[PDB]
Design an enzyme around this catalytic site. Structure first.
Site, short mmCIF file in Angstrom:
data_model
loop_
_atom_site.label_atom_id
_atom_site.label_comp_id
_atom_site.label_asym_id
_atom_site.label_seq_id
_atom_site.Cartn_x
_atom_site.Cartn_y
_atom_site.Cartn_z
N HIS B 54 60.68 6.42 85.24
CA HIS B 54 61.97 6.29 85.87
C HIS B 54 62.28 7.64 86.54
O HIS B 54 61.88 8.65 85.96
CB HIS B 54 63.13 6.04 84.91
CG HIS B 54 63.00 4.81 84.06
ND1 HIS B 54 62.28 4.75 82.90
CD2 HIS B 54 63.55 3.58 84.23
CE1 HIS B 54 62.38 3.53 82.40
NE2 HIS B 54 63.14 2.78 83.19
N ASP B 57 63.41 10.11 84.12
CA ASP B 57 62.50 10.65 83.12
C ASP B 57 61.85 11.94 83.64
O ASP B 57 61.44 12.82 82.88
CB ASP B 57 61.33 9.72 82.80
CG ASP B 57 61.80 8.37 82.30
OD1 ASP B 57 62.84 8.33 81.61
OD2 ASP B 57 61.12 7.37 82.62
N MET B 88 53.04 2.76 89.29
CA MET B 88 54.34 2.06 89.32
C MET B 88 55.42 3.08 89.07
O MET B 88 55.24 4.05 88.33
CB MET B 88 54.39 0.96 88.26
CG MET B 88 55.70 0.18 88.15
SD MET B 88 56.89 0.99 87.03
CE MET B 88 56.37 0.34 85.44
N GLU B 181 61.88 -7.30 86.52
CA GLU B 181 61.62 -7.36 85.09
C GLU B 181 62.76 -8.10 84.39
O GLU B 181 63.84 -7.51 84.28
CB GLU B 181 61.53 -5.95 84.49
CG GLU B 181 61.27 -6.06 82.98
CD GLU B 181 60.81 -4.74 82.38
OE1 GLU B 181 60.48 -3.78 83.11
OE2 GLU B 181 60.80 -4.72 81.13
N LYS B 183 65.00 -9.77 81.29
CA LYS B 183 65.29 -9.64 79.86
C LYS B 183 66.50 -10.53 79.57
O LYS B 183 67.42 -10.54 80.40
CB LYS B 183 65.55 -8.18 79.49
CG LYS B 183 65.62 -7.92 77.98
CD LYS B 183 66.03 -6.46 77.71
CE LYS B 183 65.99 -6.22 76.19
NZ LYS B 183 66.51 -4.83 75.92
N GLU B 217 57.70 -8.82 80.42
CA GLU B 217 57.43 -8.02 79.23
C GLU B 217 57.24 -8.94 78.03
O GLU B 217 58.12 -9.81 77.89
CB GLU B 217 58.56 -7.03 78.90
CG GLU B 217 58.23 -6.25 77.64
CD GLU B 217 59.31 -5.25 77.28
OE1 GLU B 217 59.62 -4.40 78.10
OE2 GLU B 217 59.86 -5.31 76.16
N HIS B 220 60.27 -9.46 75.80
CA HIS B 220 61.52 -9.99 76.37
C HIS B 220 61.52 -11.51 76.42
O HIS B 220 62.54 -12.12 76.11
CB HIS B 220 61.76 -9.43 77.79
CG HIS B 220 62.03 -7.94 77.73
ND1 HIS B 220 62.19 -7.14 78.83
CD2 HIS B 220 62.16 -7.13 76.65
CE1 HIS B 220 62.41 -5.88 78.44
NE2 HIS B 220 62.40 -5.86 77.11
N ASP B 245 54.13 -5.87 81.43
CA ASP B 245 54.47 -4.90 80.41
C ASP B 245 54.04 -5.43 79.04
O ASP B 245 54.52 -6.48 78.63
CB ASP B 245 55.97 -4.65 80.33
CG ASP B 245 56.45 -3.63 81.33
OD1 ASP B 245 55.67 -3.14 82.15
OD2 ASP B 245 57.65 -3.29 81.32
N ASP B 255 65.45 -5.95 70.85
CA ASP B 255 64.20 -5.62 71.57
C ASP B 255 63.45 -4.55 70.81
O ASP B 255 63.81 -3.37 70.84
CB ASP B 255 64.59 -5.22 72.99
CG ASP B 255 63.37 -4.96 73.87
OD1 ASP B 255 62.36 -5.69 73.76
OD2 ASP B 255 63.46 -4.01 74.67
N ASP B 257 60.02 -3.55 71.05
CA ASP B 257 59.04 -2.78 71.80
C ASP B 257 58.01 -2.18 70.85
O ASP B 257 57.73 -0.98 70.91
CB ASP B 257 59.74 -1.66 72.59
CG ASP B 257 60.45 -2.23 73.80
OD1 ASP B 257 60.53 -3.47 74.02
OD2 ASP B 257 60.98 -1.42 74.59
N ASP B 287 54.82 -0.90 77.60
CA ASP B 287 56.23 -0.53 77.54
C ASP B 287 56.59 -0.64 76.05
O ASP B 287 56.95 -1.71 75.59
CB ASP B 287 57.13 -1.43 78.37
CG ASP B 287 58.51 -0.79 78.47
OD1 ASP B 287 58.73 0.20 77.74
OD2 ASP B 287 59.35 -1.27 79.25
NI NI Z 1 59.65 -3.23 80.11
NI NI Z 2 61.60 -4.46 75.58
#
Ligand code: NI
Ligand code: NI
Ligand code: NI
Ligand code: NI
Ligand code: NI
Ligand code: NI
Ligand code: NI
Ligand code: NI
Lengths: 388, 388, 388, 388
Positions: B54, B57, B88, B181, B183, B217, B220, B245, B255, B257, B287
């Site tokens: 991002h 980041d 990406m 993406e 969610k 993802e 998600h 992802d 979530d 992850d 991710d």
């Molecule tokens: Ni993601």
């Molecule tokens: Ni997630």
């Protein structure tokens, strides 16, 4: 406040709803079968506008061509006797054991061919009875295990089936449109086109997409934990809400098909608000099962409750939107600004607009409260009729 | 059997994944921040192909134009030093308080304009660093209550935003595509475009749909209880799987992850089988969040585990499809017939085919078992390396 | 109909609720911190009866013994100034990184010892301020993976901790009872004692079970898809409802902590009906988070809404139970018979009762409808204030 | 590696499992009924240890006292012919329409009396056939709506029923114990005692709690999104795991009853690890439904798969716990410390221990990583047989 329905409210019911005998996966029927003629008459007395049917609800599977004729004629006379309409019809491609791996996407090619012929035969009957919408619920299209179904090939078969039905309708010159009814699971472990979104995306890949829309069911999107009014808004935005199935569901579990207003009551309020304010003009169809605890008096009470709860919520949503305090709150939460284009000035002017970035005060913007909690409590007060 | 990744396996990781400090809604960070340069180097040593980021980041929010330049140059040198790629990039439109009601669909119009300018600035940076895919995750686009967001107007605003970004990319002549993406929820009560299906349907309404695909993802879609390999198959069928992802999730909850392979292991097996057999050629992006119980040794162990589990499942899925007993079982379950057209002979010949209806033996067809349980146990044996 | 709360309604709020700054796992705080004194005063003006606290809400972690004294004295003066009470207190064993693997069931023994000492110190403070109930929410007690936690050993450690706290309270002669607050997940992947049922069963294994009850939270049982009024009825049946946390939740997802009445409104109605009819006399405590979209005006509006919605539902549930049509419907559905013993005549007379089996008419019994749908529509009408 | 079961593995199956004809709420049966004698013989050939039954699986409802005698004698001869045992039996209190509002907690008192007599009659038969455990699954005990069931009165009726059955067994001197089987929902909207925790808590309120334990089912706790191995650990901790039902489930949805090992495979691994390491010595009972896509060859393949997957997971869990690298990892994650008392030194010494608080280095403690991700990847490698 009186909440009596009239045929002008366009409330409709499937034959299979009030006629559900109460067989569930753990128990026997608790009610006798209802004669379709009986149902039409009882529903007319309640203030319903019309009824819907699966082929097999009206003509028992395996009927001779002449027994067929006879069942339809009785039905038509009941419709004539009561003024009831038949706005939608559909095919049963899920009950008979031959559909245990699906109809349109069965692995056996001869079953897929049979599924199409069974469908086409009922489309003809639907048009005769005046239906404008033909629903498809692919209840058996799916799988319990990963290797049993190549989903790209199954989607090819699904597209092939719908494209052929569209060819048929156009070749016959019929004025009827198709509506796909999504469900995420049950009776298959995972069902193909599991939500309103997947069905809308699939439709865009058909050869004549204009002939196809969706028939979303309240409880089915809720079985995926999704927000049903949001999904309906997306369907309306796309111009694809051809029909809708109203009922209630308490969360992520088996498909309950409770009467409308039961289950998630606030979602029912926001749904009615959206339908009425978007001017949805199709049938308000109830796809529900009176609980198997009930006798026939309970069945009719449950059907009446569907209609009653719609009319109460309609009244409360209208009062909400008409209240000047609510219109002020809407402006306070900037719903008016949401409806204005972000950049009608165009890309270059946005790029050259220093107030959009270089000199945007992000801290000032961030400090602005959205006032959503006051607005939502106004909606709660309206729903409960507690406005002081 | 050795399961060492190489850059040719195209494994990629977001800076935010191994760099997650462990702040959750109930607790403080448990790890210090990682320098992006440090992460690039450590990931290269593990066998990763590249990293993603991002904007925030890599360049801390509010950086001066020159501090910016400096952060990018350090990063580029680490990429040069290691051979790592940047396939990406994406925008952070969710952390800063100014995005509390969304970026592209915020009710405040000035925030929507700022969101677009922040995005466009990072697209330029992404192209410079060689990214081919630009992801959009509308984490704050949604609502906690019914009246706060008119979803048709919000979808108009969302379309407006993506159409403008597509205008920008085309006007600049950039070779970059967009991936949305989905969610279903979190951090908003309900998020707009909640599943792969809703995102695919939305894309078809953009002005240049060819520039947009999805970045699904694993966790998600599982937060909606959906089958992720099925959703990916629909995305592949539509030609819209631009990126993916990978991670793990245990069911319908917050979530998680988790590292890839954790969570629903059989779904991970069927996903790898599908990706490899469909010849998906993009990055295998992780991710994921190393659990906050871990120190930095645990972080790198978790990242290595992502890659390891992909390569083990790849080996097991390939062995499954190569096994002649499995090919025989596939024929026994008629997967070959699923791939054949239902009615290549056309509509009229189907209508005239008496073997499709009039003289179809439905009882014989219904008695044929599908043999899916034997096939699924062969898949289980392969997955567990227990083939006797 | 006026719905103004008074301190006699016993509405209470945690300092952490209206004081939540809006930090979530994807974003920064959107509101400044609130001074506890400020909160006490604002809540008193709204009609609240009292406040609750975690040790760390009132005395910032790591405070010197004297800074401590100072924070408490300020707080006590605000309580004196307003008439507000402090009926419950609790320990923060989840925010500090040292609790990342739990407090009472952390694998590290020195952390478990620290957790107990931190708790005991705040029990002393709670008693001083007059609290009657001490809550324990084991937010970090659990795991993300199978091998990280031997759950029988963890339950031994949990029992050991609660037994020691019970020894302490008894040895000090304190009049305070403990209440365990279940949650199924979040922030850990799975949390130990995940529902009201698991907590009730665990309590029966403590050395002095009479000192322990439950503090169920509406949203937490709903995160497991369970019926909260049913769980509360079981807790009341067992004599263990020592306290209760009221809020709203929309289904199985992350812990939303919406204001009470939001989320599942019909469940809130049946909960209020049960609490009022069982004569629950403890605090009506709200454990909720004003959404991070709100400024401080929105925070107070949300807190007021909690209380308002309780009083509206109380009025509607009382009207329901008082309505003679509803009492007739209750008899029609045989709720009166449910309350009568099945076999007060005893086992032998049941065994010799031929009307119970040999000559029981099962078909006649099966045909009797339960009339539950009419009863539920009467409840709907009452809830919506639509009784005609 | 050979994975052939023998009767010494104590694998058992209900008559209703392989004998399920495939009727689901949307479709007709796809398989003919199986003669119980046929099932016993086929299961014996597969390596099963025994079978279980509901009264109505073995003696069709409404059988004359003599037709009864005849059905039992045939069954006993098949047991004698094969060496098969009957370790558990249960009552069907859910299929017949008379149980539509429940058996033990039906609102109609005469139905509750009938339910008890039907149960007692089958307990006698179970003891005759040598069963040691009598299961109760209250599938119809619950409600679809809030007013239909006062849950405190229903729990009184439930306690009354179980207390009477305990009186009966003791008065007859039978050596048989009871096991309650929880399920959260389906076929009722919410079922009473919905999880292992609620059942354990309820048992503690019976008059002779020592006669009652639980019979948890993998899929049922997963329908509430709960961790099944955790729930089983709590049941073992309490000394109440009297029996267990093994199967597979994919998440929160309708009760799938897939073969064991399907559904959540990692949970199955951690369950087998726990059962084997705790030395659970009861039957490994499969409560599963072969999918209705299958013919009888598929039914037997699915039943064989249940047993196979248990033995593969047993081998992998044993290899995991025996691996010295895993024992080192367990120490690294301080599982050894979890098993040591927190404060064997007692309360006063804890209070006087300055290393527990005054001089506890919380920062040093917080920095220690738990190393759970490396441990979990060792478990993954073992499960997949990928240990390098
Ligand atoms: Ni993601
Ligand atoms: Ni997630
Ligand atoms: Ni439904
Ligand atoms: Ni429907
Ligand atoms: Ni909560
Ligand atoms: Ni709470
Ligand atoms: Ni089950
Ligand atoms: Ni079972």
């Amino acid at each position: 406040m009186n909440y009596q329905p009239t045929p002008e409210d366009r409330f409709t019911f499937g034959l299979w709803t009030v006629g559900w005998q109460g067989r569930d996966p753990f128990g026997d029927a608790t009610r006798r079968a209802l004669d379709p003629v009986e149902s039409v008459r009882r529903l007319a007395e309640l203030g319903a506008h019309g009824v819907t049917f699966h082929d097999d609800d009206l003509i028992p599977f395996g009927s001779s061509d002449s027994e067929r004729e006879e069942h339809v004629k009785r039905f038509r006379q009941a419709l004539d006797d009561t003024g009831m309409k038949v706005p939608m019809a559909t095919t049963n491609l899920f009950t008979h054991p031959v559909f245990k791996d699906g109809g349109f996407t069965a692995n056996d090619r001869d079953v897929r061919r049979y599924a199409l012929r069974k469908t086409i035969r009922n489309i003809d009957l639907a048009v005769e009875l005046g239906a404008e919408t033909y629903v498809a619920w692919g209840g058996r299209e799916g799988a319990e295990s990963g290797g049993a179904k190549d989903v790209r090939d199954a989607l090819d078969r699904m597209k092939e089936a719908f494209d052929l039905l569209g060819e048929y309708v156009t070749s016959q010159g019929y004025d009827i449109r198709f509506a796909i009814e999504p469900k995420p699971n049950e009776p298959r472990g995972d069902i193909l086109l599991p939500t309103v979104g997947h069905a809308l995306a699939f439709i865009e890949r058909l050869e004549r997409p204009e002939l196809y829309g969706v028939n979303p069911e309240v409880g089915h999107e809720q079985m995926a934990g999704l927000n049903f009014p949001h999904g309906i808004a997306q369907a309306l935005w796309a111009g694809k809400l051809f029909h809708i199935d109203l009922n209630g569901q308490n969360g992520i579990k088996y498909d309950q098909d409770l009467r409308f207003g039961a289950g998630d009551l606030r979602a029912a309020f926001w749904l009615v608000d959206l339908l009425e304010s978007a001017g949805y003009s199709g049938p308000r169809h109830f796809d529900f099962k009176p609980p198997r605890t009930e006798d026939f008096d309970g069945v009719w009470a449950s059907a009446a409750g569907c209609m009653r709860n719609y009319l109460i919520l309609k009244e409360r949503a209208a009062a909400f939107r008409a209240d000047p305090e609510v219109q002020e709150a809407l402006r306070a939460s900037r719903l008016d600004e949401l409806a204005r284009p972000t950049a009608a000035d165009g890309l270059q002017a946005l790029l050259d607009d220093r107030s959009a970035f270089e000199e945007f005060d992000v801290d000032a913007a961030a400090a602005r409260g959205m006032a959503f909690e006051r607005l939502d409590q106004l909606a709660m007060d309206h729903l409960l009729g507690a406005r002081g």
